[PDB]
C-alpha cells in the first residue's frame, strides 16, 4: 500500500500533464 498508492499517483500526474498540455483535436498523431 506504500508503493502501489504512489504508482497510481505518478500515473495521475502524467495523465493531467497529457490532458492539459495536449488537446485531442487539431493535428496530433503519435503525440505522447
Amino acid at each position: 500500500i506504500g508503493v502501489t498508492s504512489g504508482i497510481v499517483l505518478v500515473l495521475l500526474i502524467i495523465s493531467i500533464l497529457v490532458q492539459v498540455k495536449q488537446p485531442r483535436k487539431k493535428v496530433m498523431a503519435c503525440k505522447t
Binding site: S15, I16, Q19, R24
Partner: protein, 50 residues
C-alpha cells in the same frame, strides 16, 4: 480523454459498460484484461455474498 478513460474502468467494473471501445491493438489488451479482471471480481463477490 480522461473522463472517457476513467468511466471505461468504472463502466466495465459495474458490468454496464460505456461507449468508448478501443480500436488499436495496444488498447484492446488493456481493455481486454480489465474485462477479465472485473469478471473474476464480480463472480467472486456474488458467490461469497451467497
Amino acid at each position: 480523454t480522461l473522463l472517457n478513460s476513467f468511466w471505461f474502468g468504472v463502466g466495465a467494473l459495474m458490468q454496464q459498460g460505456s461507449e468508448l471501445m478501443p480500436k488499436a491493438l495496444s488498447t484492446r489488451i488493456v481493455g481486454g484484461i480489465w474485462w477479465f479482471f472485473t469478471l473474476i471480481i464480480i463472480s467472486s463477490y456474488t458467490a461469497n455474498l451467497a
